[PDB]
């Protein structure tokens, strides 16, 4: 009955709640309850889109309030106590859990989380130890899986191992996927669905692996939270290509077999599109190597940047599909009058000799498309007869098109990236680190402990301590800040 | 080996060729050391020096690109290996006046996709003499796609990435170039070279009774002319 | 045994050194004592890799203290002494 006062009183009392002030002095938790108004200011701010800078900026300022009331402790002990509290470090995986950037990129939480990773030089020494440990990761894998005792079996737990580990086992996989195609190892093309080359076994393995791993990734998320990373989407998109490929090749195994040669198959002959999924399949496996570079310190927030400008392009994209549209649609009705096909030995644009361009929806999108990067030559806008009014205005509409797509939309595109660049790059090294902390706690478990080729009272007193360090961490916050830094404000009338 | 044989029937490995093919690398090399001659200019130097600069913002991303550009040339010759042509032709590769056969090797391979950069690429390459109009669709997609990642999409970011660095840097430019131009003169200020290579073929305590008073006027002079005479000139708080 | 405290303890002795007024009351020669310090900090903000901005900005105050301590001078004699001495 009344929007405007309700939605009044709604921030108001939101931002009552959310003051450091108040929180410090009637609370329990001051952690939860700051994380749990983050998320939920958060959150509103998606539902109620008239309001949204304040919102933002109140769920900002609880970050910055939780980051600053975890920094005040002089104990190592301390730190780890209140890390803990809740099989380890279980709080420092609710913050992940809530996305709460600025706490996790705190410099006495990094050391404890580095030293808890290295678990004990220069580039060269690094260099040399590091690639030692892939030249022989298999037999401490054995170790591990035959005689998990304390000669080699805690030498895979520790967590920097284990990630060396199923580097090297990648690696592996890549360099066997490479070698795929060697025609030593490629007996004879002429055969409709041979069975499986050595190579072909080899890979096998490391597909059943990864397949299982995704799997009990989707276990543990179940499509929430687990097809947000787009990674993960990558993983699922990557992986149906290689299920199908196994189906499709032992369809190909049981229908046809036979020594005829290459060139009299027809189309859709099921090894083609078995080699050309296999293909596509081997272009987003070895793409996912990017990934590995956020452990990096010159390169990961390098990569990271280049990660957040994608909605700066799709958002782009768009509207140049949309003009390609419009103009291919121009361009069919004027020439599909002329198709020729006149006995020509080929085809299309893609022959030696373009011809015929302009002559069907499809063929007009594919012309408009190779015509960005110039691969267009221009005879094309031509016409067997002498019509030389018609040979005009095609090439007309075709040089709009190229001013249009190349001198007034790309530079608008270069001039908006460039602009959303300092918004971003302020914030790198902030979230990259958060990054960072995700992909090391990926590894603190003894979860996966394996390479993917090898793959197949209590807590009253707890809390009797915990609120003591509480105590201590409000009172040194509350003297040290909202008192201290008062007392430093410029002077008004 | 001497004798008067005829150049075009050597075999390759000749000594004389691979001599004729480290001399000319060697020649640009010693021709492109003339910049470093122009930081005693004061024109160029400061503009020599930014350009100096911006080199670890560009080998930082050329490793992306050629991670990229690995992974795609990986991808496409799986598709085309089973078409290797080769059927008595006069020449070979993308290095001739007809280009064929350029998805063959893993080599060849490379070499294509590195040249696809600058448009030297023409595109009839995508096409098998059989009639498989299926994969001849599969590969120019790919092509495709990576002309647009590798050309519209990432090169783009490395123009607005050195943007943004040459800010940081431009403000500290002559600060530098001058730090950089005294090393080069002081190169010369000894008896040391004085050769073009062509034709290359009590003592200290009075000094430390005089040091130690300049030292003494020097460090009262600071005392009281900055950290006095400065400190009331700050703004006023609650 | 104690990582955090022996770490900001580090961190607090050498911004304890690394000032202006401390180094002009006692040490022997200014230039060569902000020289050490500087090198010194530079290097060490490598090792550790947690506080790196910290102790990048000390090596940049002890650089602009030791230009302007050669500032203050008011005779080319002064001046040539004092970039002689050994
Ligand atoms: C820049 C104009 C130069 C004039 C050149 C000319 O007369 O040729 C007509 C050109 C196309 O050239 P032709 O079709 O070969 O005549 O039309 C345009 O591209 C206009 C661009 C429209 C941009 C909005
Ligand atoms: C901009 C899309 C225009 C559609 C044109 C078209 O249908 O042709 C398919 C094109 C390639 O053209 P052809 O292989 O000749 O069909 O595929 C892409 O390049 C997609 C780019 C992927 C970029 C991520
Ligand atoms: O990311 C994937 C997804 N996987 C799949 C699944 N299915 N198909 C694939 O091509 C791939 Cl890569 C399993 C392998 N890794 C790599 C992990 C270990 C090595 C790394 F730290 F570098 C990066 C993470
Ligand atoms: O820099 C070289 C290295 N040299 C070599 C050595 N071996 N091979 C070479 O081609 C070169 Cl240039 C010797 C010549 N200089 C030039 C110096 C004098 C002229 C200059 F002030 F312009 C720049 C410095
Ligand atoms: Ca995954």
Not at 202 to 208: F, H, R, Y
Not at 244 to 264: F, W
Not at 295 to 301: D, E, F, R, T, V
Not at 339 to 362: D, P, V, W, Y
Request: with cysteine; aromatic share 14%; charged share 20%.
């Amino acid at each position: 009955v009344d929007s405007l006062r309700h939605s009044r009183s709604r921030l108001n009392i939101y931002k009552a709640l959310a003051s450091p002030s108040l929180i410090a002095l009637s609370s329990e938790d001051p952690f939860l309850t700051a994380f749990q108004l983050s998320w939920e200011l958060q959150e509103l701010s998606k539902v109620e889109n008239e309001f949204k800078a304040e919102y933002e900026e109140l769920s900002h300022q609880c970050k910055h309030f939780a980051k600053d009331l975890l920094d005040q402790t002089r104990s190592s002990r301390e730190l780890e106590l209140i890390l803990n509290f809740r099989n380890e470090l279980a709080r420092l995986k609710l913050a992940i859990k809530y996305r709460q950037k600025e706490f996790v990129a705190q410099p006495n939480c990094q050391q404890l989380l580095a030293s808890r990773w290295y678990d004990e030089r220069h580039w060269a020494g690094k260099l040399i130890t590091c690639v030692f440990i892939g030249l022989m990761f298999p037999l401490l894998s054995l170790c591990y899986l035959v005689a998990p005792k304390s000669r080699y079996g805690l030498f895979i737990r520790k967590p920097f191992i284990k990630f060396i580990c199923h580097t090297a086992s990648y690696l592996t996989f890549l360099f066997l996927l490479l070698l795929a195609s060697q025609h030593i190892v490629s007996n004879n093309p002429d055969r409709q669905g041979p069975k499986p080359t050595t190579v072909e076994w080899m890979i096998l393995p490391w597909v059943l692996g990864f397949i299982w791993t995704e799997i009990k990734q989707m276990w543990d998320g179940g499509f929430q939270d687990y097809i947000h990373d787009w990674w993960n989407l990558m993983d699922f998109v990557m992986n149906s290509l290689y299920l199908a490929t196994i189906s499709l090749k032992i369809v190909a195994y049981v229908k046809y077999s036979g020594c005829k040669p290459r060139d009299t198959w027809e189309m859709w002959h099921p090894t083609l599109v078995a080699e050309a999924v296999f293909a596509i399949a081997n272009i987003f496996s070895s793409l996912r190597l990017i990934s590995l570079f956020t452990a990096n310190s010159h390169l990961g927030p390098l990569q990271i940047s280049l990660g957040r400008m994608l909605l700066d392009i799709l958002k782009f994209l768009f509207i140049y599909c949309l003009v390609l549209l419009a103009f291919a649609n121009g361009l069919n009705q004027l020439y599909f009058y002329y198709e020729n096909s006149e006995g020509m030995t080929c085809k299309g644009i893609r022959c030696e000799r373009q011809n015929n361009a302009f002559s069907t929806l499809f063929e007009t999108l594919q012309s408009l498309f190779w015509s960005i990067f110039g691969l267009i030559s221009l005879y094309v806008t031509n016409v067997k007869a002498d019509h030389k009014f018609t040979e005009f205005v095609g090439a007309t509409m075709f040089g709009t098109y190229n001013v249009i797509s190349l001198v007034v939309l790309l530079n608008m595109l270069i001039a908006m990236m460039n602009n959303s660049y300092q918004h971003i790059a302020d914030h790198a090294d902030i979230e990259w680190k958060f990054a960072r902390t995700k992909l090391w706690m990926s590894y603190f478990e003894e979860g996966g402990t394996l390479p993917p080729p090898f793959n197949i009272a209590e807590n009253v007193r707890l809390n009797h301590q915990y609120q003591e360090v509480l105590r201590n961490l409000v009172k040194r916050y509350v003297a040290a800040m909202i008192r201290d830094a008062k007392t430093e404000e410029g002077l008004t009338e």
